[PDB]
Design a protein around this ligand. Structure first.
Ligand SMILES: *[C@@H]1O[C@H](CO)[C@@H](O[C@@H]2O[C@H](CO)[C@@H](O)[C@H](O)[C@H]2NC(C)=O)[C@H](O)[C@H]1NC(C)=O
Ligand SMILES: *[C@@H]1O[C@H](CO)[C@@H](O[C@@H]2O[C@H](CO)[C@@H](O)[C@H](O)[C@H]2NC(C)=O)[C@H](O)[C@H]1NC(C)=O
Ligand SMILES: *[C@@H]1O[C@H](CO)[C@@H](O[C@@H]2O[C@H](CO)[C@@H](O)[C@H](O)[C@H]2NC(C)=O)[C@H](O)[C@H]1NC(C)=O
Ligand SMILES: *[C@@H]1O[C@H](CO)[C@@H](O)[C@H](O)[C@H]1NC(C)=O
Ligand SMILES: *[C@@H]1O[C@H](CO)[C@@H](O)[C@H](O)[C@H]1NC(C)=O
Ligand SMILES: *[C@@H]1O[C@H](CO)[C@@H](O)[C@H](O)[C@H]1NC(C)=O
Lengths: 215, 369, 373, 211, 49
């Protein structure tokens, strides 16, 4: 089948460059065109630009002087360069192939990578526990939580005992406050397993590569 | 800039539409974008032709691409000459100077007369098909009246597919009354294979005979069955596979998926598909010349009914034909340049002959030489 | 109310004032029995398919049931397709084509097989077939097939694409041998100019044999052939003194002396006789529809000509079977259609002309092919 | 330029229902629109091309129709793999504007939100902050409201709400509310309460904690 | 034999099953009417030796 995946830096400074590498597979990029399109959170997905199979390239009318496209047909990859990034550039980016089936159609697209354009500094997160407080066994399943506060940038990987505990795991998404990431993870274990069994949450922050274990 | 065009492809044309898709993907540009409205209707039924034409005119298009049969050439020429809408076509050339009809297939009659005058014939048979008009037949009869030839001209298209085994036997028995050694076959890509199969079945491809496949796609039929026979076979080719651009197109053509593109996983290509792939380039170059000349012909989808009385033309289409005559490019049929009428000028046709190892070019043909 | 008295009949005509207009109006004037055929005629160019299509769609939207008209090489197949689509019968005196359908009623009989019979009667080997560019495509096909069968030498000569110096060169090629056998197949309005070109060149006339493939051999202006060696043989359809045709003759002579008519007479045309006989076909067909008590309803509230998909007017097969089963003896002799809509079961006479000798050789038919007299 | 829009933002359907998704445009697009599906993981696959045809590889349960400016996609029977977001993309005039897209949802019983209040930890209180948490799990539908009260006084500053997607097991929802204040602000109050308002009950379920 | 019938080379051969016999014709009349799915290679007008 045809697949595609976009990759980038994740976090970049303002008014800097942004190179996105899109790897596609299952087809050949020498006989089809490529299109790059962004997606903002809570807004409409806007097309950024396109490059033809022959060598012609065009962009959108709003930021034509900021976007550029190149391709590597040997590795079937696309390099999209975007400069003069502003504070509203915390969005996702995706690449796709084009085709003609009596209409200009985008056949195979990509997963898209997220980019947050901010001048904030990278720091390790802080893991805090969250128990129910009272030990009253109201049911056979007891829930615990871990709050990762003060992380930069998003996201981190929060697991329970290196992926051993997976029953009732409810990981919530992170939020931003004062340029700090706040996330909460929730697990549902049995009432007799705790505190007889050690439940340790492992948080891996790839921005600072910080691995924090909290029993 | 969004340019809307119309399309009339016949029911069964898979390789032509596949090459049309390859041309649409390959020849995209930044200045504009084509948007074809494709209609898969019959080509012989002129009622469906009129319906597809008025449906393409109701969308308000600037040009119409598509084929036309010999029973529908007059309908296309009249409907495109009245409404002054250009029509690009890889079908057979017309007889006359019809405006707004730009054609992709070159002439064949002059090259065939040059080939007969090169081979120095005096008595031969001309087995033809009546699905592309009777222009070549009138040309070879008017030349036989001047050069004192013995032409035995027989049509073959009036024979049904249910009893085409004894009729062909009686035909080649009647062709042995004058002891005919020289036969010119003027048929399309389907009847040539059937006539060659019946010749092989009755056994008339040994050395001593001579055949000419009178078409532009000489290698489109099956040649492996009349290669080891001994009867040399000449013909005409428009797509030279020794060119660099043709080789680069075949290297991207044969690797295509058959499920994604029907009739594409072959080492060769039909001539109609190559003329379609060139016509996409011609239309793209003409619209790019309009984008470079700063001429605004923009309108909307409110062209009205096709049967208006009086059907008033819109004058900015008159430039569009004058656009298309300005195109001089290089495609799979070689050089592409046009006259004031709409015919093709300054082209090249290879004269192929079939040897033991395969086909071989013995020379080229033009109109100034 | 089984059948309305006024049946709309659409018409297509190339000119404004000609003999076929007066013949058509006189043929509609004899209608006394119900229903009355109301003509709706259109003077249109018969070479532009856009105008032909527009007049066809306008007459179809106005609510006619049968269209009587003409066509040309540029409209041989478009009117076959629009009639095979909407199931609307079209009656025409024009030139018969090879491939057609059951809805195109071709009033003019076939001609190529009688030509084959005359050439087999004279047993020719080498001759020159001059063909019209507008109609000589179906007859030339059968003539070249018969030439391939019987080992003939046909030299086919076009009219339109050959200039007058081309005519000079081809007759210069013809004047190098003993016998000079020429068949000419073109319409009489073109044949007058062609023979006007020829009679300045056939001043000797010795060894010149001509066959003019036309149903109007008496209509050909033979006054240029006075004191000429032309040994011309032609075909005849209408005997103007035969009892029922001369009765029709006397009827339109009596109509040409009481009130008024259109454009004048004394030089007839076989196309006008075909017009009269086709209107008589349509009259007998609507009378057969009346006496079979088969109603013809309508839904013509400005009916669309072009739609997607096609809506077949389902009543057309009854009109088609009524028009197919017409059988009488009119001005062109026997009138009778086959299962395909062409003329059969008829008779064509053969008349040779030489030195003011109007001689009848014999006649031609389909079952007893050719007989002399 | 040409702007595409969709009125329905969230649709509810069950397994086996013929679901219709509509789309509108700013002008006539001449049926040159495509419908594509995007799952929650991020993979985007095309579903219907040229507003009436189905591409090779998609199931026959989906279909498309429409004319002028109004197009629609119709699924005959929804499956487990059909839980995704459908988006319309028009390619008439460059720059091509894609639609906003709708989110299909599985219909189930309207369950009450299980609410749980959690006070701040000792290490967080030693750090100088206090983040009171309110978790509302196993709720249906996703429409719910949260209200914070500090000794009866409603406070809107410092409240952050984070919702989760529909689970693939119980077809429920989860929400987390965080009230972040200082240590002196938390010590100045005794009782903090979180109230959840859902469609299952007219009275909001309140969970309070004292000091 | 339909491919070397209209050629012109005169071909001889040997046959063991004479189709003009009464018993052979009665066997072929029951042979060609057999179902191809029930009996593979049976719905032919002739039979191998
Ligand atoms: C190819 O077909 C033609 C037509 O039958 C033949 O060409 C003849 O070739 C010989 C040998 O060079 C010449 O002397 C003759 O002048 C050719 N023309 C004729 C007989 O018309 C021949 O049979 C075939 N082979 C070749 C090599 O030409
Ligand atoms: C009927 O329409 C036809 C089609 O246009 C006319 O024939 C053309 O007339 C032009 C006049 O300049 C010639 O150049 C063309 O050669 C003609 N033939 C074609 C296009 O095939 C014809 O003149 C019209 N007749 C009337 C009476 O209007
Ligand atoms: C074929 O031609 C004859 C010519 O004599 C037509 O005339 C009919 O002939 C039969 C018997 O000779 C008569 O009974 C009829 O009354 C004649 N007229 C008509 C209108 O049928 C007739 O068209 C054809 N004859 C047959 C038998 O089909
Ligand atoms: C034909 O095209 C070639 C290729 O550009 C050109 O060199 C030549 O001059 C042209 N000849 C004519 C007569 O136009
Ligand atoms: C007319 O032609 C015929 C047939 O060739 C011939 O027998 C006859 O003698 C010719 N007429 C005259 C007057 O010579
Ligand atoms: C044709 O009319 C003439 C004149 O009356 C007549 O003598 C002749 O017999 C008629 N021929 C036929 C076949 O009716």
């Amino acid at each position: 089948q045809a697949q595609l995946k976009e990759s980038g830096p994740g976090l970049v400074a303002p008014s800097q460059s942004l190179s996105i590498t899109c790897t596609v597979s299952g087809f050949s990029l020498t006989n089809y065109g490529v299109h790059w399109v962004r997606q903002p959170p809570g807004k409409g997905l806007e097309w950024l630009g396109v490059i033809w199979a022959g060598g012609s390239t065009n962009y959108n009318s709003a930021l034509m002087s900021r976007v550029s496209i190149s391709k590597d047909n040997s590795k079937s990859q696309v390099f999209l360069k975007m400069n003069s990034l502003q504070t509203d550039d915390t969005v996702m980016y995706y690449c796709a192939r084009e085709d003609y089936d009596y209409d200009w159609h985008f056949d195979v697209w990509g997963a898209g990578t997220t980019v947050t354009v901010s001048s904030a500094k990278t720091t390790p997160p802080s893991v805090y526990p969250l128990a129910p407080g009272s030990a009253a066994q109201t049911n056979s399943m007891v829930t615990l939580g871990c709050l990762v506060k003060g992380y930069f940038p998003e996201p981190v990987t929060v697991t329970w005992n290196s992926g051993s505990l997976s029953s009732g795991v409810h990981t919530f998404p992170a939020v931003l406050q004062s340029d700090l990431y706040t996330l909460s993870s929730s697990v549902t274990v049995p009432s007799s397993t705790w505190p007889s069994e050690t439940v340790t949450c492992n948080v891996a922050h790839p921005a600072s590569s910080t691995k924090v274990d909290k029993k | 800039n969004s340019i809307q065009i119309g399309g009339l492809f016949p029911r069964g044309a898979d390789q032509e539409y596949s090459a049309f898709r390859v041309g649409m993907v390959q020849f995209s540009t930044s200045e504009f974008r084509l948007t074809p409205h494709i209609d898969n209707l019959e080509v012989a039924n002129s009622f469906a032709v009129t319906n597809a034409f008025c449906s393409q005119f109701s969308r308000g298009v600037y040009a119409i691409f598509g084929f036309y049969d010999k029973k529908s050439v007059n309908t296309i020429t009249s409907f495109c000459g009245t409404l002054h809408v250009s029509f690009i076509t890889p079908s057979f050339p017309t007889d006359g100077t019809h405006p707004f009809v730009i054609q992709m297939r070159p002439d064949l009659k002059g090259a065939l007369l040059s080939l007969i005058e090169y081979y120095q014939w005096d008595k031969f048979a001309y087995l033809y098909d009546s699905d592309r008009g009777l222009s070549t037949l009138q040309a070879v009869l008017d030349s036989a009246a001047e050069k004192k030839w013995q032409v035995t001209a027989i049509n073959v298209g009036n024979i049904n597919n249910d009893k085409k085994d004894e009729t062909y036997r009686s035909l080649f028995q009647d062709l042995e009354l004058k002891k005919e050694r020289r036969v010119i076959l003027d048929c399309e890509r389907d009847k040539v294979n059937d006539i060659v199969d019946q010749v092989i079945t009755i056994g008339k491809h040994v050395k001593g005979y001579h055949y000419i496949i009178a078409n532009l796609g000489f290698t489109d039929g099956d040649l492996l069955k009349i290669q080891f026979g001994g009867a040399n076979v000449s013909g005409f080719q428009i797509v030279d596979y020794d060119d660099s651009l043709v080789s680069k197109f075949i290297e991207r053509w044969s690797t295509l998926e058959e499920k994604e593109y029907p009739g594409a996983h072959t080492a060769t290509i039909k001539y109609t598909s190559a003329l379609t792939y060139d016509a996409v380039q011609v239309m793209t170059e003409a619209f790019r010349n309009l984008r470079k000349q700063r001429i605004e012909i923009s309108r909307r989808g409110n062209a009205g009914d096709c049967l208006a009385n009086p059907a008033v033309p819109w004058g900015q289409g008159v430039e569009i034909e004058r656009a298309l005559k300005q195109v001089q490019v290089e495609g799979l049929s070689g050089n592409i340049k046009f006259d004031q009428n709409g015919k093709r000028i300054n082209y090249t046709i290879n004269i192929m002959e079939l040897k033991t190892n395969g086909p071989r070019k013995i020379g080229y043909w033009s109109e100034v030489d | 109310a089984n059948f309305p008295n006024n049946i709309q009949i659409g018409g297509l005509f190339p000119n404004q004032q000609s003999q076929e207009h007066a013949a058509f109006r006189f043929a509609l004037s004899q209608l006394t029995e119900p229903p009355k055929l109301l003509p709706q005629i259109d003077i249109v160019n018969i070479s532009d398919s856009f105008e032909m299509t527009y007049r066809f769609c306008s007459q179809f939207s106005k609510g006619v049931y049968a269209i009587f008209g003409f066509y040309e090489r540029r409209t041989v197949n478009m009117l076959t397709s629009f009639c095979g689509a909407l199931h609307v019968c079209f009656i025409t005196p024009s030139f018969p084509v090879d491939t057609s359908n059951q809805f195109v009623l071709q009033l003019r009989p076939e001609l190529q097989e009688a030509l084959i019979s005359i050439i087999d009667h004279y047993k020719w080997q080498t001759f020159v077939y001059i063909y019209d560019a507008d109609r000589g495509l179906s007859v030339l096909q059968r003539v070249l097939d018969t030439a391939a069968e019987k080992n003939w030498q046909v030299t086919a000569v076009n009219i339109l694409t050959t200039t007058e110096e081309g005519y000079r060169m081809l007759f210069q090629d013809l004047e190098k041998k003993k016998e000079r056998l020429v068949v000419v197949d073109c319409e009489s309005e073109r044949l007058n100019a062609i023979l006007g070109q020829i009679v300045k060149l056939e001043k000797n006339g010795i060894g010149y044999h001509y066959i003019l493939a036309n149903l109007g051999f008496m209509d050909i202006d033979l006054n240029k052939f006075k004191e000429s060696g032309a040994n011309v043989t032609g075909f005849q359809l209408v005997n103007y003194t035969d009892t029922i045709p001369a009765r029709i003759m006397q009827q339109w002579r009596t109509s040409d002396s009481r009130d008024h008519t259109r454009v004048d007479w004394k030089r007839p045309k076989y196309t006008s006789a075909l017009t009269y006989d086709g209107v008589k076909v349509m009259a007998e067909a609507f009378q057969s529809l009346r006496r079979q008590r088969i109603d013809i309803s309508r839904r013509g509230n400005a009916g669309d000509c072009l739609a997607n998909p096609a809506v077949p007017w389902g009543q057309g097969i009854d009109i088609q079977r009524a028009l197919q089963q017409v059988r009488f003896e009119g001005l062109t002799g026997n009138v009778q259609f086959n299962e395909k809509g062409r003329r059969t079961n008829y008779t064509l006479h053969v008349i040779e002309m030489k030195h003011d000798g109007i001689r009848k050789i014999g006649y031609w038919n389909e079952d007893d092919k050719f007989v002399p007299a | 330029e040409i702007q595409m829009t969709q009125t329905t933002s969230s649709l509810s359907a069950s397994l086996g229902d013929r679901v219709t998704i509509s789309c509108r445009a700013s002008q006539d697009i001449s049926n040159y629109l495509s419908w594509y599906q995007q799952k929650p993981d991020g993979t985007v696959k095309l579903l219907i091309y040229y507003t009436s045809r189905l591409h090779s590889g998609v199931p026959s349960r989906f279909s498309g129709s429409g004319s002028g400016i109004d197009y629609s996609l119709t699924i005959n029977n929804l499956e487990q793999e059909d839980f995704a977001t459908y988006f319309c993309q028009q390619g008439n005039t460059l720059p091509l504007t894609f639609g906003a897209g709708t989110k299909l949802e599985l219909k189930r019983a309207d369950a009450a939100p299980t609410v749980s209040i959690f006070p701040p930890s000792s290490e967080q209180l030693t750090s100088g902050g206090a983040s009171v948490v309110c978790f509302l799990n196993n709720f249906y539908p996703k429409d719910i409201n949260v209200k914070w009260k500090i000794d009866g006084s409603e406070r809107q500053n410092g409240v952050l709400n984070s919702w989760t997607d529909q689970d693939s097991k119980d077809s429920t929802y989860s929400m987390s509310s965080t009230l972040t204040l200082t240590k002196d602000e938390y010590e100045r109050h005794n009782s903090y309460t979180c109230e959840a308002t859902h469609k299952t009950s007219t009275s909001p379920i309140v969970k309070s904690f004292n000091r």
